[PDB]
Write a protein that binds this ligand. Structure first.
Ligand SMILES: [Mg+2]
Ligand SMILES: [Mg+2]
Ligand SMILES: [Mg+2]
Ligand SMILES: [Mg+2]
Ligand SMILES: [Mg+2]
Ligand SMILES: [Mg+2]
Ligand SMILES: [Mg+2]
Ligand SMILES: [Mg+2]
Ligand SMILES: [Mg+2]
Ligand SMILES: [Mg+2]
Ligand SMILES: [Mg+2]
Ligand SMILES: [Mg+2]
Ligand SMILES: [Mg+2]
Ligand SMILES: [Mg+2]
Ligand SMILES: [Mg+2]
Ligand SMILES: [Mg+2]
Ligand SMILES: [Mg+2]
Ligand SMILES: [Mg+2]
Ligand SMILES: [Mg+2]
Ligand SMILES: [Mg+2]
Ligand SMILES: [Mg+2]
Ligand SMILES: [Mg+2]
Ligand SMILES: [Mg+2]
Ligand SMILES: [Mg+2]
Ligand SMILES: [Mg+2]
Ligand SMILES: [Mg+2]
Ligand SMILES: [Mg+2]
Ligand SMILES: [Mg+2]
Lengths: 208, 23, 137, 96, 86, 116
RNA sequence: AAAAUG
RNA sequence: AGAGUUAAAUUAUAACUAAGCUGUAAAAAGCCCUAGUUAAAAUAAAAUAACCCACGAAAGUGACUCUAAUAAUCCUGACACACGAUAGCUAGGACCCAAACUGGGAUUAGAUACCCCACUAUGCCUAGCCCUAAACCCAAAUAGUUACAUAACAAAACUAUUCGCCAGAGUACUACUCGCAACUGCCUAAAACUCAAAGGACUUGGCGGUGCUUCACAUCCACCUAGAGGAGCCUGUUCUA
């Protein structure tokens, strides 16, 4: 709240500024952006101009952090990506010439595909009608869908692992499972979809 | 307002009818 | 393109065809849209029932069959059973005012039937039988 | 109005016509009374609430040397004079 | 029953447009008063309530028509005021 | 045309039975009623049905059919856009008459005179 | 839908 | 007031199709001799027209046709005469549908209620009774006036001739009388006793499980995070002592 309503959100993209002359529709916005005497917020410490960082990676690291220990969560991402990489490399080196053209070695792509596979399509909202709560199926927003996909995996890896099992190793298992659509988070998703299909007839209770 | 007197007469008539039915 | 919404009564000499048949030979889809159920029956011009499908027959239940989704599914299945016997055009006849009125009409189009005419045959007694008493006494 | 019956000549196809005989008879006395107050050093104020000619009323009053009120009339203007206008004021001796 | 079928309350579809033909048919019944008649005949209404409904509807209609007449009469004074500042 | 009012209400001079029985006196007020906000309803139940048909037929998998999943999100986007834009568009203008805020000011300029 | 008393 | 007729729906009854139909916020019960479509007598009622305001003394009357027919050369006037909605009684007939009562199923702590289903008296015709309504438009009938003039609200204030009533409230549409095809009834209708009030309209607050618009930004839900209520300890209460 220390930032007033006049303060606007900063822009981190370098390519946005490096080529101003190639377009006029976007040329017409940034000159007014600074000619309107508009103040700009300070850039957050978590977001930088790195080419190796992803907003999805940063969000998933933020969601794992317990308390305020950010370095521990950053580490846990380090070993999670490293373990996914090394397990995929061990699988890479044990196959025949045909499978190396299909097996992916990129942890970022594997993580993004796992999140897309874990992303639900429809959600449920409790609606009170006649003194009882009915689970009405409702379309979810993109941010809600991705938040559910992320939270389901984090919750599953937090509780359904053995005490000797470490978080990066368990997450490396479930990432490869969710990439191929064989993980328990996919089962949770399909459970929500089935419970929405069973109450499809109750969707008329929604008024929006 | 007038419903007070109307209800008083209604109650009197109902009690009279119940008494007639009993006796 | 002079088109009239008035029906092509057999008394006139008009020239309108649908799949080679006259308006008098095109089958009828009787659709009773009640307040708690929607029943669809496809009969021929000779009053022979071809396809029948209702929200109750669609595997629905007590209150779930009164929604428009149940009516649409019943229309889709009735359209499938009608197409199974080789029908192209049908005349919809709507009976009663309910929630599954338009949804079960569009169910035939979704299931693969062309609607050429819609007739509202709703029971309107001119003060005949006395209906039941009003609720919420 | 019900009280304009004696001041009218008749009705010309729905539209009422005011006879000018009594109009002139009243206007003679009206102008005489207005002139006498000005002669005897009296305050004359033109009150008129009509948003078409108000400018003309202030111009006429300024040329006459008298006062005008064509804007929204406040509540206690003439009654609560010792408060709305000033501590001690002089009430207008004639209102047009 | 005794009348010939497919003549009354029938709307012919043009170019396969069913959704708009249904709206036209619904307009037919609403402007002929059949929809309200069905919704009123679903449950029986006593004559005492029928008289009250008729009186309320007639009074509401009279008030609405008079208000609309006054609105249409005063529509002319919607123009921008040219004597602003007077 | 306005319905007749002669011989309708119960008055001393009326010899016949009253016809209309007003809940409130039939005096034309100086302000119109505020416009009613329409009740909302659920959107694309029809497309949700064809979305769930793929899931019931193909054993609940999104890789079988993809268009029935994409048009559902298209409906979500268009329904959100219609919820946001129209909430201001319909409140600004009516396209048939004036807004009530201008109507009350117009009526107050030429009010009714039940008295005098 | 439901739902009493001071 | 009589006589004749029925356009839509509904049903007894047959034929094809289906395994479900009805039912509510949701269910259960009920019916599966069920449901949809095509044909179908009898009974009951009489969409739009009606945004019309007519007829009759009032109650009351608006599907169609025919007959008879709507007093007074027109003041008021009863305890006399004649009518008098629905509800109820008697005898015979009718019964599609609706429904007191009743029996099941819901909800509730209870529900002999509101919600759902079935059915009876009853609503229907003829004859004979009963003579009651918030029978109110709470504004008596006959000829008038817009003069004086707003307790309040409401349908503005009033004249001339009359009839019927009005003497605090509860007791009391009560007891006792008379009369009445009414015998749990109708009309007329007190007293003992209790109180110093009982009443009508209105002003402002407050409230509203009345209704309509704008909202909730840690705030009600939709939703995010970390905790309490589970264990030990510290500490503060209520209890015993
Ligand atoms: Mg008493
Ligand atoms: Mg009652
Ligand atoms: Mg008369
Ligand atoms: Mg009132
Ligand atoms: Mg009001
Ligand atoms: Mg108690
Ligand atoms: Mg007779
Ligand atoms: Mg018939
Ligand atoms: Mg029979
Ligand atoms: Mg059952
Ligand atoms: Mg009729
Ligand atoms: Mg006469
Ligand atoms: Mg007489
Ligand atoms: Mg009687
Ligand atoms: Mg009877
Ligand atoms: Mg019976
Ligand atoms: Mg029944
Ligand atoms: Mg019971
Ligand atoms: Mg009456
Ligand atoms: Mg009286
Ligand atoms: Mg008299
Ligand atoms: Mg006053
Ligand atoms: Mg006394
Ligand atoms: Mg009595
Ligand atoms: Mg008595
Ligand atoms: Mg909170
Ligand atoms: Mg803790
Ligand atoms: Mg504890």
């Amino acid at each position: 709240s220390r930032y007033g309503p006049e303060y606007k959100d900063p822009q981190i993209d370098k390519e946005y500024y490096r080529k101003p002359l190639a377009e006029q529709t976007e040329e017409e916005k940034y000159e007014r952006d600074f000619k309107k005497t508009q103040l700009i917020k300070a850039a957050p410490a978590t977001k930088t101009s790195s080419v190796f960082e992803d907003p999805v990676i940063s969000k998933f690291t933020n969601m794992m952090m317990k308390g305020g220990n950010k370095v521990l969560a950053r580490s846990l991402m380090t070993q999670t990506l490293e373990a996914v990489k090394r397990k995929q490399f061990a699988k890479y080196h044990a196959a025949s010439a045909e499978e190396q053209a299909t097996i992916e070695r990129n942890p970022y792509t594997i993580f993004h595909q796992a999140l897309k596979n874990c992303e639900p399509v429809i959600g449920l909202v409790p609606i009170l009608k006649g003194g009882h709560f009915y689970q009405v199926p409702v379309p979810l927003a993109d941010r809600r869908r991705r938040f559910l996909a992320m939270k389901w995996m984090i919750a599953e890896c937090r509780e359904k692992k053995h005490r000797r099992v470490l978080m990066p190793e368990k997450l490396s298992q479930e990432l490869l499972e969710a990439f191929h659509n064989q993980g328990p988070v996919i089962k949770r998703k399909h459970d929500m979809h089935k419970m929405a299909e069973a109450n499809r007839a109750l969707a008329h209770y929604r008024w929006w | 307002k007038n419903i007070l007197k109307i209800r008083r007469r209604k109650m009197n008539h109902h009690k009279y009818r119940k008494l007639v039915k009993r006796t | 393109s002079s088109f009239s919404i008035y029906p092509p009564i057999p008394g006139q000499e008009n020239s309108l065809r649908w799949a080679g048949k006259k308006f008098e030979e095109i089958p009828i889809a009787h659709i009773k849209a009640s307040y708690n159920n929607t029943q669809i029956q496809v009969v021929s011009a000779a009053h022979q029932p071809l396809a029948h499908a209702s929200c109750g027959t669609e595997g629905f239940r007590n209150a779930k069959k009164g929604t428009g989704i149940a009516a649409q599914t019943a229309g889709i299945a009735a359209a499938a059973k009608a197409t199974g016997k080789g029908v192209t055009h049908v005349r919809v006849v709507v009976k009663g005012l309910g929630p599954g009125r338009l949804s079960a009409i569009k169910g035939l189009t979704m299931g693969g039937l062309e609607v050429i005419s819609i007739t509202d045959n709703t029971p309107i007694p001119h003060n005949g039988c006395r209906p039941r008493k009003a609720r919420r006494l | 109005h019900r009280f304009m019956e004696p001041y009218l000549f008749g009705s010309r196809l729905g539209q009422d016509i005011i006879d000018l005989e009594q109009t002139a008879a009243h206007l003679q006395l009206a102008l005489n009374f207005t002139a006498h107050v000005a002669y005897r050093e009296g305050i004359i104020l033109f009150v008129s609430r009509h948003r078409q000619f108000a400018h003309l009323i202030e111009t006429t009053a300024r040329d006459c040397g008298e006062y005008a009120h064509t804007r929204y009339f406040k509540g206690g203007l003439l009654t609560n004079a010792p408060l709305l206008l000033g501590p001690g004021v002089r009430l207008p001796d004639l209102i047009i | 029953a005794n009348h010939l079928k497919f003549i009354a309350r029938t709307v012919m579809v043009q170019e396969g447009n069913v959704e708009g033909a249904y709206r036209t048919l619904n307009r037919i019944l609403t402007m002929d008063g059949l929809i309200e008649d069905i919704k009123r005949r679903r449950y029986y209404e006593k004559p005492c309530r029928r008289r009250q409904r008729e009186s309320y509807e007639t009074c509401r209609r009279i008030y609405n028509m008079e208000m609309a007449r006054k609105i249409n009469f005063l529509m002319r004074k919607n123009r921008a005021d040219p004597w602003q500042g007077c | 045309a306005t319905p007749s009012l002669r011989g309708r209400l119960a008055r001393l001079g009326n010899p016949r039975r009253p016809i209309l029985k007003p809940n409130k006196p039939l005096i034309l007020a100086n302000h119109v009623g505020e416009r009613r906000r329409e009740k909302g309803e659920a959107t694309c139940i029809t497309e949700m049905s064809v979305m769930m048909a793929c899931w019931k037929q193909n054993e609940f998998r999104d890789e079988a059919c993809r268009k029935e999943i994409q048009d559902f999100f298209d409906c979500a986007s268009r329904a959100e856009a219609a919820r946001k834009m129209r909430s201001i568009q319909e409140n600004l203008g009516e396209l048939g008459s004036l807004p009530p805020k201008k109507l009350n000011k117009l009526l107050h300029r030429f009010p009714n005179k039940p008295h005098v």
